[PDB]
Amino acid sequence: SVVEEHGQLSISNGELVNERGEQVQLKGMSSHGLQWYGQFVNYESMKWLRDDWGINVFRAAMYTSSGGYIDDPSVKEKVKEAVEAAIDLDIYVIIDWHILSDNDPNIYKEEAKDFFDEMSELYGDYPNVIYEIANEPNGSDVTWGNQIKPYAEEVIPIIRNNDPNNIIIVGTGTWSQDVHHAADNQLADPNVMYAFHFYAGTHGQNLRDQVDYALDQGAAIFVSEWGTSAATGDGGVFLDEAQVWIDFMDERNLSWANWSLTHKDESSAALMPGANPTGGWTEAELSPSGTFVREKIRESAS
C-alpha cells in the first residue's frame, strides 16, 4: 500500500515528497551487517515489520569491508532478496553501500560505481528504491570538499544513467554528522539527500541545531541510521533523549531508519538473542530498544 499510495518520491525545496507533491515521511528499520546477520533479512521478517510495526522503508546495510562485499560479493544476493521483498511488499528499500572502517569513500570508488550501475540497471524503474552511496565517511582527513562531494559527483551519474529520478542519500563527514558542511556546498542533482546519523546516548541539542542549520540552507536530510544507545554502547538505552530526537524529526518530517534489526547483544539491537529470524516476534523477543522503536513506528502508522 505504501508505494502504491506515494509512488515516485522526489525532493522539493529540501522536502521528501510523493508523486502528488505531498510530504512523505518514511520510518523503518536497518538491518545490521548483512555478512553477519543476513538471516534477519527476508520476505517474512520484512512483512512482519510492515504488518506488525508499520514500517514503510527497510535499509539493507551491505558492509564493504569487515568480511563484506569487497571480500565476498555474494552478500549482494542478500541485497537483491531484500529489494525484491520490498517490491513485493510495496514498501521502500534503501541499498546501503556501508562504508565504515574504510572511512574514505574513494577507497572503493571503482567497486561502488560497478555495484550501483548493476543495481540501478536492475531496479531503476521501481519507485521503491533509494540508493545510499556511502554510509559513514569519517576521520579528520575525510571532508566534504576534498573527498565526499567529488565521490558523489562521480557515482551519481553512474546511477543517473540508468535511473534518472530515484532518491540518492549521500553520507557526510564525521560519521554522517557534518550536514552543515555539505549544506554549504550542495550537489546539483535535484533528487539528493544528505545523511545525518546519531546516537541518543551521545548526541543532543548541538547536533540538532546543526541539522537545523543544514535544513535552513535548503538541504534535504535523511536520518538513514540512528541508535537508542550511547556510541560507547555502555549504560543501556537512552529512550528519554531518543524521544526528544523522535519529536524533533516529526516536527521537521524527517525520514529515518533505526539501527538495527539483529539479536546481537548490544543495546541498540532491536531483538533479544535467539529471536526468530523470520519474524512473528513475541514481546519477550524484543529488546527495550526494539520495544520503543516498534511503538514509535506503530503510533504513526495508518
Ligand SMILES: OC[C@H]1O[C@@H](O[C@H]2[C@H](O)[C@@H](O)[C@H](O)O[C@@H]2CO)[C@H](O)[C@@H](O)[C@@H]1O
Ligand atoms: O557482531 C558483528 C561485528 O560487529 C562490529 O561492531 C559493530 C556494532 O555491532 C554496530 O552496532 C555498529 O553500527 O557498528 C560496529 C562496526 O561494524 C564489531 O566491531 C565486529 O568485531 C563484529 O564481528
Ligand SMILES: [Ca+2]
Ligand atoms: Ca523463501
Ligand SMILES: [Ca+2]
Ligand atoms: Ca552499465
Ligand SMILES: [Ca+2]
Ligand atoms: Ca527511477
Ligand SMILES: [Ca+2]
Ligand atoms: Ca574522478
Ligand SMILES: [Ca+2]
Ligand atoms: Ca553508525
